[PDB]
Design an enzyme around this catalytic site. Structure first.
Site, PDB file in Angstrom:
ATOM      1  N   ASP A  74     -18.655 -17.891   0.589  1.00  0.00           N
ATOM      2  CA  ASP A  74     -19.177 -18.299  -0.709  1.00  0.00           C
ATOM      3  C   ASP A  74     -20.480 -19.084  -0.617  1.00  0.00           C
ATOM      4  OD1 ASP A  74     -18.136 -20.725   0.301  1.00  0.00           O
ATOM      5  OD2 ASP A  74     -17.744 -21.462  -1.724  1.00  0.00           O
ATOM      6  N   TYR A 130     -27.523 -23.010   5.775  1.00  0.00           N
ATOM      7  CA  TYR A 130     -27.063 -23.507   7.067  1.00  0.00           C
ATOM      8  C   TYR A 130     -28.118 -23.438   8.166  1.00  0.00           C
ATOM      9  CZ  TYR A 130     -22.188 -24.377   5.883  1.00  0.00           C
ATOM     10  OH  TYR A 130     -21.026 -24.901   5.366  1.00  0.00           O
TER      11      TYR A 130
HETATM   12  N1  LIG Z   1     -15.963 -19.060   3.668  1.00  0.00           N
HETATM   13  C1  LIG Z   1     -16.410 -20.198   3.156  1.00  0.00           C
HETATM   14  O1  LIG Z   1     -17.594 -20.390   2.889  1.00  0.00           O
HETATM   15  C2  LIG Z   1     -15.400 -21.277   2.858  1.00  0.00           C
HETATM   16  C3  LIG Z   1     -15.483 -22.107   1.745  1.00  0.00           C
HETATM   17  C4  LIG Z   1     -14.476 -23.012   1.492  1.00  0.00           C
HETATM   18  C5  LIG Z   1     -13.421 -23.119   2.372  1.00  0.00           C
HETATM   19  N2  LIG Z   1     -13.357 -22.355   3.487  1.00  0.00           N
HETATM   20  C6  LIG Z   1     -12.234 -22.520   4.453  1.00  0.00           C
HETATM   21  O2  LIG Z   1     -11.049 -22.816   3.734  1.00  0.00           O
HETATM   22  C7  LIG Z   1     -10.095 -23.408   4.645  1.00  0.00           C
HETATM   23  C8  LIG Z   1      -9.316 -24.475   3.919  1.00  0.00           C
HETATM   24  O3  LIG Z   1     -10.182 -25.607   3.660  1.00  0.00           O
HETATM   25  P1  LIG Z   1      -9.506 -26.961   3.135  1.00  0.00           P
HETATM   26  O4  LIG Z   1     -10.504 -28.068   3.196  1.00  0.00           O
HETATM   27  O5  LIG Z   1      -8.812 -26.697   1.840  1.00  0.00           O
HETATM   28  O6  LIG Z   1      -8.404 -27.190   4.279  1.00  0.00           O
HETATM   29  P2  LIG Z   1      -7.134 -28.163   4.378  1.00  0.00           P
HETATM   30  O7  LIG Z   1      -7.094 -28.770   5.740  1.00  0.00           O
HETATM   31  O8  LIG Z   1      -7.147 -29.081   3.200  1.00  0.00           O
HETATM   32  O9  LIG Z   1      -5.914 -27.127   4.236  1.00  0.00           O
HETATM   33  C9  LIG Z   1      -5.770 -26.056   5.208  1.00  0.00           C
HETATM   34  C10 LIG Z   1      -4.342 -25.566   5.202  1.00  0.00           C
HETATM   35  O10 LIG Z   1      -4.172 -24.536   6.213  1.00  0.00           O
HETATM   36  C11 LIG Z   1      -2.883 -24.682   6.758  1.00  0.00           C
HETATM   37  N3  LIG Z   1      -2.811 -23.969   8.028  1.00  0.00           N
HETATM   38  C12 LIG Z   1      -3.300 -24.394   9.238  1.00  0.00           C
HETATM   39  N4  LIG Z   1      -3.084 -23.549  10.214  1.00  0.00           N
HETATM   40  C13 LIG Z   1      -2.398 -22.502   9.617  1.00  0.00           C
HETATM   41  C14 LIG Z   1      -1.881 -21.296  10.129  1.00  0.00           C
HETATM   42  N5  LIG Z   1      -1.977 -20.934  11.405  1.00  0.00           N
HETATM   43  N6  LIG Z   1      -1.246 -20.471   9.263  1.00  0.00           N
HETATM   44  C15 LIG Z   1      -1.151 -20.843   7.980  1.00  0.00           C
HETATM   45  N7  LIG Z   1      -1.598 -21.948   7.388  1.00  0.00           N
HETATM   46  C16 LIG Z   1      -2.221 -22.749   8.268  1.00  0.00           C
HETATM   47  C17 LIG Z   1      -2.739 -26.192   6.879  1.00  0.00           C
HETATM   48  O11 LIG Z   1      -1.425 -26.628   7.157  1.00  0.00           O
HETATM   49  C18 LIG Z   1      -3.265 -26.622   5.505  1.00  0.00           C
HETATM   50  O12 LIG Z   1      -2.231 -26.542   4.532  1.00  0.00           O
HETATM   51  C19 LIG Z   1     -10.931 -23.889   5.841  1.00  0.00           C
HETATM   52  O13 LIG Z   1     -10.761 -22.998   6.934  1.00  0.00           O
HETATM   53  C20 LIG Z   1     -12.349 -23.802   5.267  1.00  0.00           C
HETATM   54  O14 LIG Z   1     -13.381 -23.769   6.239  1.00  0.00           O
HETATM   55  C21 LIG Z   1     -14.333 -21.427   3.731  1.00  0.00           C
HETATM   56  O1  LIG Z   2     -15.424 -28.974   3.303  1.00  0.00           O
HETATM   57  P1  LIG Z   2     -16.911 -29.182   3.146  1.00  0.00           P
HETATM   58  O2  LIG Z   2     -17.588 -29.854   4.315  1.00  0.00           O
HETATM   59  O3  LIG Z   2     -17.311 -29.737   1.799  1.00  0.00           O
HETATM   60  O4  LIG Z   2     -17.523 -27.694   3.138  1.00  0.00           O
HETATM   61  C1  LIG Z   2     -17.846 -27.069   1.897  1.00  0.00           C
HETATM   62  C2  LIG Z   2     -18.080 -25.573   2.082  1.00  0.00           C
HETATM   63  O5  LIG Z   2     -19.340 -25.207   1.517  1.00  0.00           O
HETATM   64  C3  LIG Z   2     -19.521 -23.791   1.476  1.00  0.00           C
HETATM   65  O6  LIG Z   2     -18.466 -23.201   0.711  1.00  0.00           O
HETATM   66  C4  LIG Z   2     -19.504 -23.220   2.892  1.00  0.00           C
HETATM   67  O7  LIG Z   2     -19.563 -21.791   2.832  1.00  0.00           O
HETATM   68  C5  LIG Z   2     -18.245 -23.643   3.639  1.00  0.00           C
HETATM   69  O8  LIG Z   2     -18.347 -23.252   5.012  1.00  0.00           O
HETATM   70  C6  LIG Z   2     -18.054 -25.152   3.546  1.00  0.00           C
HETATM   71  O9  LIG Z   2     -16.802 -25.520   4.136  1.00  0.00           O
HETATM   72 MN   LIG Z   3     -18.892 -20.071   4.644  1.00  0.00          MN
END
Ligand SMILES: NC(=O)c1ccc[n+]([C@@H]2O[C@H](COP(=O)([O-])OP(=O)(O)OC[C@H]3O[C@@H](n4cnc5c(N)ncnc54)[C@H](O)[C@@H]3O)[C@@H](O)[C@H]2O)c1
Ligand SMILES: O=P(O)(O)OC[C@H]1O[C@H](O)[C@H](O)[C@@H](O)[C@@H]1O
Ligand SMILES: [Mn+2]
Ligand SMILES: NC(=O)c1ccc[n+]([C@@H]2O[C@H](COP(=O)([O-])OP(=O)(O)OC[C@H]3O[C@@H](n4cnc5c(N)ncnc54)[C@H](O)[C@@H]3O)[C@@H](O)[C@H]2O)c1
Ligand SMILES: NC(=O)c1ccc[n+]([C@@H]2O[C@H](COP(=O)([O-])OP(=O)(O)OC[C@H]3O[C@@H](n4cnc5c(N)ncnc54)[C@H](O)[C@@H]3O)[C@@H](O)[C@H]2O)c1
Ligand SMILES: NC(=O)c1ccc[n+]([C@@H]2O[C@H](COP(=O)([O-])OP(=O)(O)OC[C@H]3O[C@@H](n4cnc5c(N)ncnc54)[C@H](O)[C@@H]3O)[C@@H](O)[C@H]2O)c1
Ligand SMILES: O=P(O)(O)OC[C@H]1O[C@H](O)[C@H](O)[C@@H](O)[C@@H]1O
Ligand SMILES: O=P(O)(O)OC[C@H]1O[C@H](O)[C@H](O)[C@@H](O)[C@@H]1O
Ligand SMILES: [Mn+2]
Ligand SMILES: [Mn+2]
Ligand SMILES: [Mn+2]
Lengths: 440, 442, 428, 441
Positions: free
Chosen positions: B171, B265
């Site tokens: 995203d 980034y």
């Molecule tokens: N693609 C992007 O740009 C983008 C944007 C936003 C978030 N994300 C990703 O979303 C994910 C969640 O972010 P968050 O801050 O909400 O995390 P968080 O730490 O608040 O929650 C993550 C959850 O994943 C669970 N988890 C861990 N290992 C697991 C496994 N093997 N199987 C199933 N569940 C598992 C944890 O127990 C927890 O409930 C992160 O990996 C983050 O980088 C990516």
């Molecule tokens: O959890 P933060 O440090 O706020 O990151 C916020 C997020 O911004 C965007 O969505 C990026 O694509 C993610 O990679 C990042 O995790």
């Molecule tokens: Mn990303």
């Protein structure tokens, strides 16, 4: 959303009445300002324009028609230019088909030594059409070219005019899936297939009717009956396309990976095509006494005030597929069509200058071709031969080289020997004086 | 036409209440049989499930919610799996950022040594998620993966499980497109851009609003103010001062290199000097989301259990949920939506290797993604992608072959790491801090 | 065979007395008609030429010496031109290294910003040497160029002059092969190694003495004491230990451990000043003592496998001896995973018609990524010379590993433009 | 060091010739024992008689051993010279008979006949490799010069990539012999640049003592072909077919004026002139039965009776000398520049990696070091790409046991004018080669 000047390059064509009506069938989506008919044969276009004047009268009398032979009038502020020229006419076509059958090789409009001869007649006239639009037409013009040979013209125009706002298409794939749709009781708008290869040199890898894969259901039928079906007989009235659609049965049975294009009969089985044809009644002779006669007869009936049947020309998916390409270019509809684009990595194990015929999403800025990937070895080897054959033929026109054209004739699968290529080439040079570029 | 079983792999995520509401807003297009929340942490997921039930009770009370920690119960007959896992949680994220800043390197979530460390924690757990769906889920399942690091996990999952019905998205480009929408006073629906590169490592070659090319107008604004406009301040993402500094740093990059509009980034790769000085060892970005996004989502859980009213619009911000739901929706109805997804190259970008997981526009079909033939990219952007692709490629080989030397080669290759000597001291620091999460490296 | 006209492009070099003697030792195979010394500093060339004629008459007093600065005079009917020029001289090398250490970067002659800056000075002077020989020299002439930076020069000259009869070599791979032979108690002519990479950016995959592979025995010793033996070099023990596949080129100490070099380098006394008060000063004092009649020691310049390696390539070009050497050549498929215009340093057989490079094949990922970065770095710098682009030069500076960020790259490039006005092309 | 030399296929008609050319380098090749291995016990012992009297007249101190046991012949083997023709010299006749039955060219290495010969030799070659990797010396070398070298080298590299094998061919050297006789140049001073597949290449440049002679050769070859007046004196020109093959190259060199063509291009570029020229009841495979094979079995019978044999009728041709020079270069690391068959892998850039191209390379003691030749023009890329796909599909038919891959390969071949003819030829070859061809489902 703006008033558009639609220009038909080759107004005296036999497909002109059918193209106009299919363009008038999409009036609420294509804002036509002036429908222009351009040609270099004035008295021939005037006869065909009389039918266009009746097609306009019967479908949409408000459309303003314009007929001219001056390129400045026809192409000034031209928005879309649907190209459909036949350099030399059908009279030169039968000359290509007679010389080929005289030497025992296949004589076809686009395949074999005949299509290569037809190509070098259309290379430079097509480039002249490009330069006309670059000078007079709109700065964001579009040339939806479907004039043959599409494989040689698209390869030549891309190497000579890489910046040309042009889209080279063919309806033979559309005609095949029209047959495929009837085999399944599926509607043609719900059909969609994955495809790759050169023009008149491709394969249907996967077919689906409304998202559900089908390729196996079609493979079973084509290997037994070909592309003909019980409902297909209701173009299938032509006794020559029934031979082509049936001839796909043996090809799809020997090579079972994909569903073949009908033009593979001239390359995979040229010996059977030669014995099937007749030098005293070639395909070009069959359309001079057929499609061209019925369009000249209709022009004479209009001059005599007699009623004409305008539905003779409203047949085929030819006109419908071409207007859709234009319609997608106007409103950015992202229509997925099997068009011809420069490779440049679309098919990885092919050259960059190769003009592959692959699915692409038609945007208002051009075609966005889908990355296909690697193709099997048997299909790479066949395409590598034709791509080198077409490439050597284009280089023969750029460099004015006799040996380059001789190399291209020897490369073709139709020509069986290097000695036959030289004898076929020397006859074409004699029959194309004033058409071909001079070879040294 | 068919009722679908949607599973959120990682229901204890801070983004779970957001995408649940964004999924319920498309109720006519997505026929939800059941909504499943799967996670490995039972207590953390049960607190987030309290908010999900409150979101369901507010937007669509007819949707049944099932919560479980058993993978067989969670993934049996699963139709769509939305992965948002964070292996190690936010606890391991702050430890990755602190170890990097201890060695004078950029400590980021997905970039630098912190991202490579986060990547190796996610490779095999992601592969286990794939094998769950191959064994238990429907034969036409789809895993719309948006868990980070999307660059490393996509290259790893494609090498180990090439036949997986998975689509990796991000995203960050969509969030940049939201800023470009505000700069031009253009609606986000009317925006569309041409893009290439790796995840968090790309470039916007052309951008157009309502079909009209607006790239030259955008780069005029970005070179002076970055991706920040006066209307950008009004939204919720730009409230965080770190995101303001992050978007405003694009002015220098867009001024030195004038071909394309850069991905956000590039702040950490092209300018590691200005980032090591900007970050605080005792208040890294992971610590900020612990005292911020994670704090406010576990506070709302306690407020629900105390009967106090919870403001559910806290988690309804960002284009995060809108973009992920659009992908699944385009997979269901074959809408042919043009999105920036991560696909295997295989000739899409000609100057790059076949196994390079590039981030390019593609049409989302019910059969997968059909990427467009991008073509050749100029030299300056080939050499940058070649270095990272080798870096990410060597890191995937370190997880498969259990080779310590491949990991050292991966850290030495990265632009954030100045020398191979710093790469070893950082690698060995990650070996100890990730004992239990990383694969063994001999 | 035929009496040849040998030309030294850069007669005022501190290496000229060594190249001349190494060329006189092979006089039985090289039929010299007249030895020429070409340069643009006639004041500096005439003083070094005093050492040459004294080397001539103490080794072979029957060869004719010629000292000119007219380009048409030196290159008319020239059969072999041995280029060893240094654009800007040693007085600009000290400024390239001081500017890098001004910003805490690697201040080296050929690696980093100092190398890129030096390369931007040698591109067009090299092109002019090519166009001098294409019209004045023999139609089968050969330019054996070993003047640094060979990596940037070979890539720039091949794109600008593709049909140039030029051979780009470097003795650093040969100097390592010399120290390798001392470790194994092997004669230098019996050692032979497989090699790949860019100039000052490659690796030794296999090394063999008298046919027997000795790679494992070497890397055992090199991981402990470096390329130094009991009979800069010692720093390669860390690189050979962290990466166990190949034996590294010594120049990897600037790319793989740049900040470690910065702590080792003194800005007030750079490497370019060590040669000013070292090798260069011993050449001018020798020419001074020659002018005063004092007996001079000519053996102090005869040191090194530097000159003997360049003469061997020329002798192989004359009599078509098929000498296998590590030569910088256009890739064009020699290494599959690299671009066509990449100037790789791979073993090739020196024929009478040029170098025939062996097909190396595919290289592993870690070495592809490092080469792809440096090749794009050098490719962008060459494009900055041709296109006169400031952004291309900035892109090349950002690509280099020794540069920590693009911020330092802009401050580094701007300082180079100030100090190299009159040597660099315009950059708009 | 002492070397155990093994001739794989002792019953071959070239065995006395290569033994003579091997004994001429006895000072450069320390021969410990000379081993003659074959599967035909009766045929080899008869040919072994000539080998016994060849060693008697040349170097009677060489120890000769004959056997049909692979463990005896290949144990501790240092150098093995491949020379097999599985199916024999009469399965070759039926290859050239079936092709002419369908109006196609019947050649040993080209057309459907060569593809059929290749399918017979693929797996026997794989077994020869596995025999050496299991029994022979750890640094063995297989100098393979048995046809079809193009299909065999492609199959042996795809199946046994780490095999210590070097595929060569004397056809470019036989042409270089003819070229030297035109210019009064010596064969030792000839040297040419060359690219393409085995029996599918082109001479780009030719040098006599380092001086280019390509333009001078084009002037003669475009008139008389590779035939000259001094060539007629050589024993190969006493055969009426080897004169028609060297003069047929006049038209090919006149139409395509870039390079001098390999003499095997008459079968690909002229399938009309060849089928017209060939007699089905007296093919080339029959001319060697009552010709080359008759003169060697006449000599074998002359020995066992006591009649002294003329051994110099087997001592002609660049075939033996060119092979012995390659094995000598592997022993002493002489770096001899020869036209060999190697995996492409970027050698010819605009060709596939798994393509086995015939390019010059320096024969070291560790294998061949091929030179990087670069990209080839379009007309020569398309021709090679078609044949490379043809040989590639044929190798896949052997590995995958697929009938369709074989039909695809027979269709791709230039000498086959139709898929209909390709199917009819394939079905006849399957029935005639039962027991030699692998199963094709
Ligand atoms: N693609 C992007 O740009 C983008 C944007 C936003 C978030 N994300 C990703 O979303 C994910 C969640 O972010 P968050 O801050 O909400 O995390 P968080 O730490 O608040 O929650 C993550 C959850 O994943 C669970 N988890 C861990 N290992 C697991 C496994 N093997 N199987 C199933 N569940 C598992 C944890 O127990 C927890 O409930 C992160 O990996 C983050 O980088 C990516
Ligand atoms: O959890 P933060 O440090 O706020 O990151 C916020 C997020 O911004 C965007 O969505 C990026 O694509 C993610 O990679 C990042 O995790
Ligand atoms: Mn990303
Ligand atoms: N690609 C496909 O699928 C497909 C299908 C149908 C027809 N076509 C192409 O349609 C074209 C017309 O077919 P037809 O049977 O109507 O031909 P036709 O001979 O009946 O008419 C062709 C017209 O083109 C005109 N023309 C010739 N050279 C011209 C030039 N340089 N500029 C402008 N006009 C020129 C002629 O004067 C004539 O009016 C042919 O090129 C044919 O191959 C292609
Ligand atoms: N590649 C290798 O293995 C290797 C080894 C040693 C030295 N080198 C390089 O070879 C060169 C040897 O010179 P040096 O270090 O003794 O320096 P130097 O200053 O003593 O000599 C360089 C000479 O080049 C002359 N020169 C400058 N511009 C010229 C031009 N346009 N045309 C002709 N001559 C010109 C100068 O006037 C001077 O006489 C340097 O570039 C050095 O770095 C390379
Ligand atoms: N440079 C070249 O490309 C070149 C030159 C000359 C001959 N050749 C090849 O040399 C080979 C021999 O020709 P010839 O006329 O002497 O043949 P031939 O029929 O006279 O002898 C061939 C021998 O191979 C033996 N053989 C068969 N299968 C075997 C196996 N599995 N292992 C070992 N031996 C086996 C046979 O029993 C027979 O003795 C042919 O394959 C021919 O094409 C190629
Ligand atoms: O100039 P010095 O510091 O003595 O460097 C010693 C020489 O060896 C190096 O390998 C380089 O090839 C030369 O550019 C250098 O001059
Ligand atoms: O036709 P034949 O007498 O069997 O000779 C055929 C032989 O001659 C050629 O010169 C080639 O070098 C061999 O590969 C070929 O097999
Ligand atoms: Mn068509
Ligand atoms: Mn050097
Ligand atoms: Mn052969």
């Amino acid at each position: 959303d703006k008033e558009l000047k639609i220009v038909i390059c080759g107004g005296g064509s036999t497909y002109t009445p059918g193209i106009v009506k299919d363009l008038l069938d999409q009036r609420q989506k294509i804002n036509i300002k002036e429908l222009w008919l351009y040609d270099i044969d004035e008295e021939r276009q005037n006869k065909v324009a009389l039918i266009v004047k009746e097609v306009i009268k019967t479908e949409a009398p408000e459309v303003v028609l314009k007929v001219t032979v001056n390129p400045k009038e026809a192409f000034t502020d031209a928005d879309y230019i649907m190209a459909q020229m036949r350099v030399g006419g059908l009279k030169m076509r039968v000359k290509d088909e007679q010389i080929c059958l005289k030497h025992g090789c296949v004589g076809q409009e686009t395949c074999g030594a005949g299509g290569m001869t037809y190509g070098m007649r259309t290379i430079y006239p097509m480039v002249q059409l490009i330069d006309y639009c670059e000078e007079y037409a709109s700065k964001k013009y579009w040339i939806v070219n479907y004039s043959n040979p599409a494989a040689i013209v698209a390869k030549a125009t891309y190497k000579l005019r890489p910046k040309a706002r042009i889209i080279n298409i063919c309806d033979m794939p559309v005609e095949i899936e029209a047959r495929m749709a009837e085999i399944l009781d599926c509607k043609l708008e719900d059909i969609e297939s994955d495809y790759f290869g050169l023009n008149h040199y491709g394969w249907f890898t996967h077919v689906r009717c409304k998202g559900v894969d089908v390729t196996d259901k079609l493979k079973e039928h084509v290997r037994k009956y070909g592309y003909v079906s019980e409902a297909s007989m209701n173009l299938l009235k032509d006794p020559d396309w029934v031979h082509t659609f049936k001839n796909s049965a043996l090809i799809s049975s020997m090579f079972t990976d994909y569903l073949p294009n009908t033009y593979w009969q001239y390359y995979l089985m040229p010996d059977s095509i030669v014995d099937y044809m007749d030098i005293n009644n070639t395909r070009g002779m069959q359309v001079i006494n057929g499609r061209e006669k019925r369009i000249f007869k209709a022009a004479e009936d209009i001059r005599e005030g007699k009623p004409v049947d305008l539905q003779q020309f409203y047949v085929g998916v030819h006109g419908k597929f071409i207007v859709k390409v234009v319609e997608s270019l106007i409103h950015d509809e992202r229509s997925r069509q099997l068009v011809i684009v420069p490779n440049n990595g679309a098919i990885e194990n092919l050259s960059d200058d190769a003009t592959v015929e692959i699915p692409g999403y038609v945007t208002d800025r051009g075609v966005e071709p889908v990355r296909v990937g690697s193709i099997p070895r048997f299909y790479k080897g066949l395409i590598e031969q034709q791509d080198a054959c077409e490439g050597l033929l284009v280089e023969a026109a750029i460099e004015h080289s006799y040996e380059k054209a001789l190399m291209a004739f020897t490369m073709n699968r139709t020509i069986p020997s290097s000695l036959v290529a030289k004898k076929l080439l020397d006859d074409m040079i004699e029959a194309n004086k004033g058409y071909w570029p001079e070879l040294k």
